[PDB]
Amino acid sequence: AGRFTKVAAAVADSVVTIESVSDQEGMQGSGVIVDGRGYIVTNNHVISEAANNPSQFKTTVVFNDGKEVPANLVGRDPKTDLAVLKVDNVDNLTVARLGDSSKVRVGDEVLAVGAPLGLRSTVTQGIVSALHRPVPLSGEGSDTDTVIDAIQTDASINHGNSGGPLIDMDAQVIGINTALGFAIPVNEMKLVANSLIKDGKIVHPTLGISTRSVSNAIASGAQVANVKAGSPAQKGGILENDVIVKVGNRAVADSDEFVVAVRQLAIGQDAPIEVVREGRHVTLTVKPDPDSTLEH
Amino acid sequence: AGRFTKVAAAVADSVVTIESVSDQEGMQGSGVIVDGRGYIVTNNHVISEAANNPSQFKTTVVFNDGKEVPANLVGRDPKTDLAVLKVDNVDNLTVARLGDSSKVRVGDEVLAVGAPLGLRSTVTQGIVSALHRPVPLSGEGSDTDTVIDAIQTDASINHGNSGGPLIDMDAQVIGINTALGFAIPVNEMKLVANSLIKDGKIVHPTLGISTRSVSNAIASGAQVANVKAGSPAQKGGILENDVIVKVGNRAVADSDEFVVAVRQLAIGQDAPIEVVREGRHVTLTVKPDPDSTLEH
Amino acid sequence: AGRFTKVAAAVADSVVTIESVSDQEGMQGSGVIVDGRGYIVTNNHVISEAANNPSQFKTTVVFNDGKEVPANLVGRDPKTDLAVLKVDNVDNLTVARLGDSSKVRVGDEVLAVGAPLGLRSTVTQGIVSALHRPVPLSGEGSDTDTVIDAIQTDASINHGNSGGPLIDMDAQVIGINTALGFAIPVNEMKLVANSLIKDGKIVHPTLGISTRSVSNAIASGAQVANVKAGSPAQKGGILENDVIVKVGNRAVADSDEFVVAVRQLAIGQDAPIEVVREGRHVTLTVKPDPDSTLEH
Numbered sequence: 001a002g003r004f005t006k007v008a009a010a011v012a013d014s015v016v017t018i019e020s021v022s023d024q025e026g027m028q029g030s031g032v033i034v035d036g037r038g039y040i041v042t043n044n045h046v047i048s049e050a051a052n053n054p055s056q057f058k059t060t061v062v063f064n065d066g067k068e069v070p071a072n073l074v075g076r077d078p079k080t081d082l083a084v085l086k087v088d089n090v091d092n093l094t095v096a097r098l099g100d101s102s103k104v105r106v107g108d109e110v111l112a113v114g115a116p117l118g119l120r121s122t123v124t125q126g127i128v129s130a131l132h133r134p135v136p137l138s139g140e141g142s143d144t145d146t147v148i149d150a151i152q153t154d155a156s157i158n159h160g161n162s163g164g165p166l167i168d169m170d171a172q173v174i175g176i177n178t179a180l181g182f183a184i185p186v187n188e189m190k191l192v193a194n195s196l197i198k199d200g201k202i203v204h205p206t207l208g209i210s211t212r213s214v215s216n217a218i219a220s221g222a223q224v225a226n227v228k229a230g231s232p233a234q235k236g237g238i239l240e241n242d243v244i245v246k247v248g249n250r251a252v253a254d255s256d257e258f259v260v261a262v263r264q265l266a267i268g269q270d271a272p273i274e275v276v277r278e279g280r281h282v283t284l285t286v287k288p289d290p291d292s293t294l295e296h
Numbered sequence: 297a298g299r300f301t302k303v304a305a306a307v308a309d310s311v312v313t314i315e316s317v318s319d320q321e322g323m324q325g326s327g328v329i330v331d332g333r334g335y336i337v338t339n340n341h342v343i344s345e346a347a348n349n350p351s352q353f354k355t356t357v358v359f360n361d362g363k364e365v366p367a368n369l370v371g372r373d374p375k376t377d378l379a380v381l382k383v384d385n386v387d388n389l390t391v392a393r394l395g396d397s398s399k400v401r402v403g404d405e406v407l408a409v410g411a412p413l414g415l416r417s418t419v420t421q422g423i424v425s426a427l428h429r430p431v432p433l434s435g436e437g438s439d440t441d442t443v444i445d446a447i448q449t450d451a452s453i454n455h456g457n458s459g460g461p462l463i464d465m466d467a468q469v470i471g472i473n474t475a476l477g478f479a480i481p482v483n484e485m486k487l488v489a490n491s492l493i494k495d496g497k498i499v500h501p502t503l504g505i506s507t508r509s510v511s512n513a514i515a516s517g518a519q520v521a522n523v524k525a526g527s528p529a530q531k532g533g534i535l536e537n538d539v540i541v542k543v544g545n546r547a548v549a550d551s552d553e554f555v556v557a558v559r560q561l562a563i564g565q566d567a568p569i570e571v572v573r574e575g576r577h578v579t580l581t582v583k584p585d586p587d588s589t590l591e592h
Numbered sequence: 593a594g595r596f597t598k599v600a601a602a603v604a605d606s607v608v609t610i611e612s613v614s615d616q617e618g619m620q621g622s623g624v625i626v627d628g629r630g631y632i633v634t635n636n637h638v639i640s641e642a643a644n645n646p647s648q649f650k651t652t653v654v655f656n657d658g659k660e661v662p663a664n665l666v667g668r669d670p671k672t673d674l675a676v677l678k679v680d681n682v683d684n685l686t687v688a689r690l691g692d693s694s695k696v697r698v699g700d701e702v703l704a705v706g707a708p709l710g711l712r713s714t715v716t717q718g719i720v721s722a723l724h725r726p727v728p729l730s731g732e733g734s735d736t737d738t739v740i741d742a743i744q745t746d747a748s749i750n751h752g753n754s755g756g757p758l759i760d761m762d763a764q765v766i767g768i769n770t771a772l773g774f775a776i777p778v779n780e781m782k783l784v785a786n787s788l789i790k791d792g793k794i795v796h797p798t799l800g801i802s803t804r805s806v807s808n809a810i811a812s813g814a815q816v817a818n819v820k821a822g823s824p825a826q827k828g829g830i831l832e833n834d835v836i837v838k839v840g841n842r843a844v845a846d847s848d849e850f851v852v853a854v855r856q857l858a859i860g861q862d863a864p865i866e867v868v869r870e871g872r873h874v875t876l877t878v879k880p881d882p883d884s885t886l887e888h
Contacts, residue, residue, distance in 0.1 A: 004423055008403035026511040058513065106715050107600035107703065111403065119549055122425040123402050124450040127596055129714040154716040154748050156450050156476065180748065215618040217650065253711055300719055304699035322807040354809065407699065415845055418721040419698050420746040452746050452772065
């Protein structure tokens with residue numbers, strides 16, 4: 001038995017097919033079994049329509065034996081494109097082994113495993129081509145466009161393995177595939193899923209800034225496009241056509257790194273923001289607000 | 297010598313360049329030597345123009361030593377995109393070793409080998425990403441569009457390895473490359489080529505149905521678009537806007553699986569066809585006819 | 593540590609980030625350290641704008657420790673898409689080990705290594721899919737379009753590894769990545785860089801011909817589109833609508849092979865050019881001129 005053949009066959013019982021059907025449409029994707037009680041992690045674009053219109057869509061989970069069981073949505077994070085599902089009282093579940101994406105290195109052999117019984121299902125191979133790479137993700141329906149600090153791989157990520165696990169050579173999950181390929185690291189997926197299960201959703205920081213990427217010799221980075229009224233940036237001194245070069249303890253190369261850096265902040269604790277303003281380097285003190293105040 | 301380098305160098309003398317030239321055009325592709333008498337298997341799109349207009353095209357086979365010899369067309373199956381060529385009295389031929397595609401598993405390392413002396417020739421590497429996957433194939437000229445139950449690979453299939461062999465790690469042919477990559481399994485290629493050699497062509501079943509894929513909660517599958525007059529479906533009870541969910545002993549997910557399922561039937565023996573008709577599940581009894589009555 | 597992980601980590605200190613910034617633009621690419629004195633090889637499209645407008649662009653080299661040092665351009669060959677840069681008095685430089693691309697074989701495992709600290713940086717994996725393959729390359733700004741005799745790989749070549757090294761499994765440089773992937777062989781890169789360092793630039797042969805690819809049964813190859821006045825081809829007998837099938841000791845399949853074959857000639861020594869003229873095979877005697885007479 002082949003070396004990748006062995007790894008894929010060992011995690012096949014942990015990958016599931018996720019279908020949501022209405023009377024006129026039907027979405028399919030992949031998911032991962034991460035808890036013996038029935039908690040299944042997929043990405044947010046696979047389920048987006050079934051959450052914006054749950055009155056008309058029905059989500060089901062198909063296992064690798066063919067069993068189809070009802071599934072309910074625990075929570076979903078469009079800003080990390082993640083989601084947690086729940087199947088009830090299904091026995092003999094083959095839970096996936098969750099690894100440490102902090103120990104993942106560039107050039108490591110990986111497998112992007114999709115659900116075997118899916119329609120356009122795929123299992124692709126490659127290596128890790130980049131770590132902590134911000135990639136912009138387009139929201140499905142009414143869902144917002146986001147940027148995630150991602151693992152990059154030259155294994156192909158497509159409709160057939162989206163939501164499925166990125167697997168290392170010890171058959172451990174190191175990421176969630178989001179459909180030149182990108183995956184959500186498992187350590188962030190663990191933090192997000194632990195909150196989606198407990199609280200039904202997750203709360204992220206906000207400053208009220210929109211940015212556009214700038215690249216020149218004066219100041220390259222994220223150029224502020226709009227500052228919301230009453231926002232922490234407005235009450236921190238951030239002006240428009242300012243070039244943010246660092247949010248907190250992270251340098252900012254463009255707007256994509258800016259989104260990830262803001263979301264690596266602490267809600268309600270002052271943080272430093274460097275800005276190049278008309279050639280004058282100005283550091284500012286901004287107190288991040290929560291994107292959801294009542295859930296916080 | 298590298299691990300893939302060894303496998304590719306062992307099958308290079310079995311892959312050939314296939315050129316067909318007129319006074320205004322010229323096609324090139326790849327082929328595989330599968331019989332010591334000179335029988336060469338390629339795909340149907342490589343030779344299509346030389347068969348629809350043989351009065352004006354001339355097909356030649358170039359070996360990996362550089363020898364160019366005349367070649368004649370034994371038969372061609374546009375419905376499986378396969379073809380058999382014949383070189384005469386060429387000695388010391390390095391025949392390829394044909395494997396068993398039924399023993400191919402997902403994650404198996406593969407090589408998509410093109411003819412070395414070709415123009416845009418390529419030898420690509422990857423894994424098997426799916427098995428028994430129906431993929432639609434567009435016909436070249438007057439040739440019909442078809443769907444094949446294929447092996448999927450993340451090795452790149454392109455003009456440089458089309459018609460060439462998909463090779464396992466024992467240097468055995470497990471498929472024919474058809475130009476996110478797809479190959480025709482070797483076990484089907486053996487059945488098709490054995491008939492193209494003996495009979496000059498092959499006969500497949502037909503029911504006289506055209507379908508369109510449907511995806512919803514009532515009935516997903518192949519929705520009948522047109523039923524031909526006097527057809528086995530017409531004389532079996534199949535109506536239009538019916539949703540076929542199973543042809544014979546194969547479930548049907550869409551129109552692509554429907555084409556492959558009809559062609560897995562027995563000509564002239566009654567077979568069951570499930571249909572969801574206005575919400576009523578109706579199984580029907582259809583007797584497949586041959587697509588070519590006189591050759592049958 | 594993984595097998596590719598080990599190779600990539602051993603050459604990471606030899607790959608550098610190359611940035612050129614003006615007041616309105618900024619280009620980034622990758623480069624390779626090939627000489628302890630500070631000589632850095634990248635490709636020509638990475639630096640093209642900083643050489644056509646050096647009054648307004650500033651080129652810098654960022655190492656894998658993060659050090660940013662000034663960099664100056666020694667020479668650039670748009671016809672091979674190569675360039676040599678120079679950093680001054682930088683100590684403890686981790687020079688790359690240059691291999692022999694003549695010993696590279698098809699199916700050999702390779703790594704297309706980009707600069708780790710780059711923005712869209714990538715390290716991709718694949719195999720050598722073709723050797724001595726002419727590929728056309730589009731010039732960046734005012735730079736001319738060229739064709740290079742290249743190494744082809746199914747490792748992805750992109751903005752994140754362009755200019756970086758193609759690395760074998762002994763962690764040796766066998767090519768320079770030029771952004772279904774192509775690389776400039778290391779043996780040609782050694783000849784070109786040795787002249788760009790000594791002489792500031794390189795001189796290539798010219799015949800004064802433009803060609804278009806032709807493919808039929810009479811004569812396939814490079815069809816002459818225009819012959820310059822006073823050119824070696826004009827004074828050799830080459831006429832328009834002639835089909836060149838061989839330049840010197842190299843057969844010519846199309847215009848792309850023609851460009852590489854002319855550049856494999858000797859300036860000022862008579863050479864044979866076969867042509868199929870109105871069905872008559874005519875060999876001609878052409879004396880290649882230098883593309884730059886004073887530098888020659």
